[PDB]
Each structure stands twice: as C-alpha cells, then as structure tokens.
Amino acid sequence: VMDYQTIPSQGLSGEICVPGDKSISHRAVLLAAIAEGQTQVDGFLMGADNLAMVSALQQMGASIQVIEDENILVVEGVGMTGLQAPPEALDCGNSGTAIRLLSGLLAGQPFNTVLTGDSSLQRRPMKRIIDPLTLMGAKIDSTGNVPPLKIYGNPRLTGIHYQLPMASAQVKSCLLLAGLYARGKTCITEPAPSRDHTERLLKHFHYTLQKKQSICVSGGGKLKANDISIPGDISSAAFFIVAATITPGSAIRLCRVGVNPTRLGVINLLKMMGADIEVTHYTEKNEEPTADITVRHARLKGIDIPPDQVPLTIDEFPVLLIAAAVAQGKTVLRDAAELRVKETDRIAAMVDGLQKLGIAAESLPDGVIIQGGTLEGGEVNSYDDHRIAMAFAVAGTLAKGPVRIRNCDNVKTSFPNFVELANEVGMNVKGVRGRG
Numbered sequence: 375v376m377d378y379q380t381i382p383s384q385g386l387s388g389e390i391c392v393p394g395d396k397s398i399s400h401r402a403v404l405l406a407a408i409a410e411g412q413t414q415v416d417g418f419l420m421g422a423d424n425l426a427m428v429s430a431l432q433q434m435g436a437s438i439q440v441i442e443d444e445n446i447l448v449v450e451g452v453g454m455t456g457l458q459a460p461p462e463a464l465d466c467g468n469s470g471t472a473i474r475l476l477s478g479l480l481a482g483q484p485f486n487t488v489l490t491g492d493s494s495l496q497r498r499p500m501k502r503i504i505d506p507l508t509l510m511g512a513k514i515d516s517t518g519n520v521p522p523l524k525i526y527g528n529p530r531l532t533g534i535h536y537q538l539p540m541a542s543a544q545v546k547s548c549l550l551l552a553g554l555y556a557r558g559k560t561c562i563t564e565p566a567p568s569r570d571h572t573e574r575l576l577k578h579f580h581y582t583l584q585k586k587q588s589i590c591v592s593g594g595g596k597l598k599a600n601d602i603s604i605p606g607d608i609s610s611a612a613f614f615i616v617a618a619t620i621t622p623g624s625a626i627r628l629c630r631v632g633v634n635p636t637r638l639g640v641i642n643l644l645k646m647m648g649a650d651i652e653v654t655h656y657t658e659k660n661e662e663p664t665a666d667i668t669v670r671h672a673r674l675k676g677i678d679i680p681p682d683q684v685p686l687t688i689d690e691f692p693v694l695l696i697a698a699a700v701a702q703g704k705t706v707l708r709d710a711a712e713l714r715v716k717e718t719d720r721i722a723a724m725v726d727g728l729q730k731l732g733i734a735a736e737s738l739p740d741g742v743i744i745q746g747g748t749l750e751g752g753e754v755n756s757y758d759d760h761r762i763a764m765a766f767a768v769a770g771t772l773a774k775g776p777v778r779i780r781n782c783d784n785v786k787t788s789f790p791n792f793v794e795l796a797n798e799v800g801m802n803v804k805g806v807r808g809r810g
C-alpha cells in the first residue's frame with residue numbers, strides 16, 4: 375500500500391500535457407468496439423478505469439489492440455450484433471462510468487451479463503439507470519439498487535420518451551446506448567443541459583441524432599469506424615490549475631486540454647474568485663474542442679457558488695475546495711448532494727481532511743461552508759478516492775508543512791502519471807510506503 379508525501383512548493387512552472395479524458399475514453403472504445411471497420415484511438419487514457427472497460431469489452435469478443443506506451447488503441451469493430459456472451463461477471467473495478475454505460479449497451483443484447491466491481495463501486499447508486507432501462511423492457515436484477523447487476527438481455531427493447539428528474543449521471547449516455555438497440559426512437563429530455571460527450575461521439579461514428587431541449591436516437595442504425603483523437607482531461611488539468619493559482623511564484627501552461635463548455639466549471643468559478651487563467655490556441659479536431667490553458671498565481675476571494683455552475687463543476691469540487699480554503703473570506707457550496715454518492719462521500723472526505731489541515735470547514739447535506747484560512751501540514755485520508763487524494767496533494771503546495779495523504783493507489787484510476795507530472799512542474803509529491 376502507498377501514500378503521497380508532500381512538501382510546500384516554491385512555485386509551479388513549465389508546460390505539460392495532462393493525459394486523456396476519462397469520460398471520452400470510455401465512450402470512444404465502447405462505440406469503436408461495436409462499429410464497423412477499424413478505429414484508431416489516440417490519446418486514450420491508460421488508467422485503471424479505462425483499461426477495465428477495455429478488458430470488459432474483450433471478455434465479450436471486442437478486438438482491441440492496446441499500445442500502452444503511446445496511449446493508442448487499435449480497434450477492429452465487431453459491428454452492432456458482434457459481441458459474444460462473456461463467461462464470467464465483468465469486473466468494472468472502480469469505474470462507475472463503465473458499469474453504467476455497459477448496462478445501457480448490454481440491456482438489449484441477446485445474452486445475459488453480470489456486472490460488478492470493487493467495494494466502492496458496489497455502493498454507487500444504480501436506480502437512476504435501472505428504472506428507465508426497465509421502461510424500455512430491460513430486466514436487471516440487483517439488491518438495493520447497487521451493483522452487482524445481473525442483466526437479462528432483451529433484444530426486443532422498445533424506445534421510450536424519458537425525462538430524467540436530474541442532470542444525468544451517465545443516465546443520458548446509458549439510455550442513448552440502449553436506444554441504438556431499441557425498436558423505434560428513444561428521446562431523453564433533461565432539466566439543465568449536461569455533458570454531451572456521447573452525442574458528439576455518436577455523430578463522429580455517423581449515427582443519426584436529433585437534435586430541441588431534448589435528444590433522440592432511433593434504433594437499428596450502424597456505427598461506422600472513424601479515427602478519434604482524445605483531448606486532455608480538464609478534470610485532470612484542474613489539479614494543476616488550482617495548484618498554480620494558489621502557489622506564489624507560479625506560471626504554467628497546460629497544452630491540448632479539452633475545453634468542452636459542459637466541463638469548464640472549475641475555470642468559470644476560479645475566475646469568479648479572482649483567478650488568472652487564459653485560454654488560447656483553441657482548435658476543433660474531431661468532435662471535441664481543445665485549447666491551451668495558461669495559469670498564474672492569483673489571490674482569491676470566497677464566493678457563493680452559483681447553483682447553475684454545480685453540474686459544470688461537480689467533479690472538480692474536491693480541488694476547488696482547496697482554493698476556497700486559501701481564499702480570503704467565506705465560500706458556500708449548495709445543491710451538490712451528488713458529491714455524497716461518488717467513489718466516497720466527497721463532502722465528508724473533504725471536510726474531514728480540511729479540518730485536519732487546520733481549515734474551518736463545515737458540512738451541509740448538499741454542500742459545504744468553508745472559511746478561507748491557512749493550510750497547515752498534517753495527515754489526511756484519501757478514502758480511496760482518486761480526486762480526494764489529488765486534491766490534498768494540491769493542498770500540499772501551500773500547506774505550512776508536509777502533508778501525508780494515506781492510500782493513493784487509486785490515483786491511477788484516472789491519472790497514472792500524476793506524480794511524475796506534479797514533480798515536473800514543481801509540485802512536490804513522493805509515493806512512499808503506507809500502512810495496512
């Protein structure tokens with residue numbers, strides 16, 4: 375078992391490219407697997423979650439060559455009906471995304487599948503997908519609406535018109551995938567817009583989409599192979615953006631980062647707090663916009679986080695709360711109860727760690743109240759959550775003393791080369807032997 379140990383930073387500098395987007399990587403390889411023809415995937419995130427998605431597809435006879443050192447996949451698609459019944463339960467590891475997407479993919483197959491994963495994954499809520507999939511005629515056994523899930527494939531799924539009562543957590547993507555195999559059209563309508571990585575990829579693979587506040591697909595179409603280049607993960611960049619923001623003497627450039635508007639919340643909010651962040655060299659390679667992000671040290675003020683930014687920033691709140699901890703004044707986060715049902719309860723985790731580092735932090739059922747202050751050295755627990763681990767690694771840049779973050783083995787689920795890149799820009803992090 376291993377921990378991260380930090381010492382304060384004298385300032386970040388240089389230019390780095392963060393690894394590929396986790397969310398786009400999952401969808402890219404899944405769609406490529408069932409496409410017709412050969413898809414080359416560049417920038418695939420070679421992390422534990424995305425490789426679990428790869429292994430899972432391979433158990434069902436996807437043809438995927440992994441070239442790990444180059445972040446490349448070469449996928450020979452097996453076509454829409456080309457998958458084969460896997461012999462054992464599919465282990466999604468730590469990956470909520472993989473299990474929810476596979477559920478959509480597998481609901482309409484002519485075979486049965488069991489989906490499971492690690493302890494954390496077996497606590498992630500699935501009611502949100504089970505219910506709509508069932509409306510389409512899926513049959514999914516589960517206890518307490520958490521994995522493991524047993525899917526009894528139904529090749530005669532029916533399109534539904536569904537209005538999700540919540541900015542989807544892969545619910546839209548899940549139903550869209552099921553929609554490809556359903557008879558008729560499947561229409562998903564949502565209160566507020568959410569991530570659209572799936573829609574962009576469906577278009578990329580030439581599957582017809584329509585189109586106003588809702589989105590529809592009709593089943594029985596074909597996915598057509600089309601090479602894809604995956605942008606840097608802005609959720610991964612977020613750690614360095616906060617680090618360069620709060621560490622005096624810092625100036626860095628993050629190259630080739632995805633800047634999808636539905637993912638830009640951390641930038642939007644930091645700027646509101648007074649951050650110094652410039653987006654340049656904006657380009658549009660296939661489907662996903664990417665840009666370079668230049669960050670310089672800046673003093674921050676606490677803010678009331680606007681409710682409309684919450685969906686745009688949900689995954690960056692761990693590291694954003696570090697910025698709040700060192701800002702001048704109070705920060706209030708509301709409407710973010712979804713933080714409690716992630717890999718760990720992220721509100722409880724962040725509040726626990728912040729208090730251990732000398733920050734006045736207070737939990738709400740749907741968020742947190744932070745009084746900006748001074749980070750001390752100390753020791754915190756990652757709660758096995760990659761973003762909690764990395765958030766406190768970022769805390770270490772400004773903490774008065776060393777920060778020990780226990781149990782960081784799961785950082786590689788989303789950011790395999792985190793330690794290397796951190797030390798490269800001047801964020802001091804070392805992996806050391808942990809306990810237990």
Ligand SMILES: [K+]
Binds near residue numbers: 423468470
């Ligand atoms: K995960």
